[model samples]
Target: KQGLTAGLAEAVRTSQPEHSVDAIRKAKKGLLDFTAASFAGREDKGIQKLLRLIEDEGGRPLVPIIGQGKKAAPLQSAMLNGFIAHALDFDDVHSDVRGHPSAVIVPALIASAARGHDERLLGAYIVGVEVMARLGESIGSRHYEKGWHNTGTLGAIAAACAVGYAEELTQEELEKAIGFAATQSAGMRVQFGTEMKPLHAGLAAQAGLLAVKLAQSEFGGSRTAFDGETGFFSLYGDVEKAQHTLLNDWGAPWRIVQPGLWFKIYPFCSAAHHAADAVRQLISEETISAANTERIEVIFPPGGDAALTERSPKTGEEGRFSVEYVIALALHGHGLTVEHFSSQPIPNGIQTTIGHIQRVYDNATQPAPHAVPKGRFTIVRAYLSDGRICEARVDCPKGAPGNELSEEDIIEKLTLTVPQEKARRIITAVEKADIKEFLAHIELE
Candidate 1:
């Protein structure tokens, strides 16, 4: 029987860059964003901790770790690079996937880029996003609500597909690769607020790269990897939906350009971005001092704030998932930066400020049409001692589609982690499709 995997393999086999110029350009920006995020996140406490493990258990030096001045075996490189990119929660996300796309796909393609050269990496990267987004659409929102971390679970299959495309795997070989990666799918939302969250991204990439490697060696697997009754769809998602949307358009208009890459302005989970932007605007005209402030309220549709799991965060990592913490920092007039998010107990002032925040969910209220995650939005209200209230509503966060980040903005973002000169070079190298040169700019001395 011809399975869904068969069609996906054919899609990959026939994908050409000339067919989608805008998508390829979008994929290029994705690489630049991932590079910048990886550079900044390489110094994450958790990333460094894992680096020590990789150092202790050394492997053949076959690849580079961005900003670390070190090489690792292919699998280790994929893992560490993926970890570094998403560790800060600063990487670009995709709406269809409801998770980070470039973080998982880019690292796998980087490793695969070694196989052959000619901008195939970009082409492969596009298919990766396509596969990941389509699969996420098939899984439905329940996959996320059920606490299955989409990045860790859906990421492996997409990454495997990306590598398979790059290596020009036959349709049969690609099916086996997808099957192997599906078997390895894992990660849970319970890991939020800990280092394990980023570990999921790394391990997903590692699993994907390993899956392709195994398949390339003529490994055997259920040919109907995705369509089998007891296979991926049955175990993880809606089989009917997978059948419809997973390959519906199949690059008629690439996912990279439609519902595209969602870049992050703040180095926190995007769930809080809408609220953060709302609060920042509320206090922009008038500084929010304790003397004049009462309390702040954040409203969302039912389950809109589900990703804000760390409601009473005591550490910076926990704060990343706390809508209250991000709102408090914004109201306190502090720029949201790595420094603002690095404090252990959060800052004393921000900790106290957080107490003045409350989150309310109202399913009765109509959400804006352009809200991220398709149909969710946030509204923030600031109450003042003077009996006056300031309110702001954000349906689209900065760096999301329609409210996208420009090249200048992303360059500024990278400057927060590296020098401007290097940032310029990194963007240029990616634009030129110079893989080796791009990696050179990322590798630290």
Candidate 2:
């Protein structure tokens, strides 16, 4: 707990100008992407059912639901908005925790910000991410390996930081928020293949909103929520390996700025990023054609295996996580865009060709280079008919920390996901409006 108080204090008090700027821009992009995804996801059967239930049980409008225009209480807003943002698993991610951080944190803030606190939204967002990342670090990687979905656990805690900061909660209230968030943290990895994945984000958002609200009402909680003998650290975090330094370097070394974020160029898990990159490279480099390529051999680091669970994907959701199917589509000049994951069947020939593509494990312990964007470094050796062989290696994909996406790139991605006029409006609002002013443009409907 050496730097805990100091870190928490700064998280409560200080605000760096540049960090705020970056946070604003990042938050805008996060909002745009969340809007596009939520609008599209509102059509999903599961999400539609949930929305209808909320509509039937009428409550006073508190915050906006993207594409719906009307409002629900902040908690419900967080739940529904969180679900929509992550319905496709296509939102932005922070690689350290291997979950979509913004998908949960942003929606929560967006809901709370709607209650007239936009000037502070950017700072709150930065703090939220910092809290989540630091908590993930404190917990060690074992929390994730143990099957706890960091999206829900880390996200809940982070959302507390966001809501607390936005409300200008006192230090004591903030501490309670942290403890409340920690107590409510829950998610499981077993839900990955089911409709439950997005539930993690929604639950996290709801928990965080409730935590802050409870804290504001003077709901007491354990002070050492993060590091106490029987606290979050004791339960989820690996105390022995926890990096106490996260507390010391709070504002000076902003994790949000340093590690940055990973915007998804393709609507899939991060694990499949490398395979998709490699296949796209094969096509771009003319090393293989969908028509001529017979087989692909994907050589990846250990991390890749965790997400690419499907070998023969039958649904678009399955294809998003399937290395074989993604590579197949990529070879046929189909990038890993939402379009490719749009319920279209994997062409029979492409499916057959992809079956020939195989995943090989690299015994080395070194991670795929994080310096490259998406950290998608991989060595793909191609085997073609007529005894032809070709090879391609990609260090980073288009949207990654090493190689950041341009604002134009983000806008273009939005355009692809939503109508052109809406995309342009979002881009213009983000580029020009002040943090507080920008909130006016976010019409859920």
Query: Best candidate per lDDT, number?
Result: 1
Give candidate 2 regions above 4 Å deviation.
1-10, 15-24, 40-42, 333-335, 342-347, 363-376, 435-437
| TM-score of each candidate structure, all chains considered together | 0.95, 0.91
Q: Which ten residues in a row have the lowest lDDT in candidate 1?
A: 111-120
Q: Judged by TM-score, which candidate is best? A: 1
User: In model 2, how large is the Cα lDDT of residue 49?
Assistant: 74
- Name the TM-score of candidate 1: 0.95
Distance from true position, residue 335, model 2, in Å? 4.4
Worst 10 residues of 2 by lDDT: 1-10
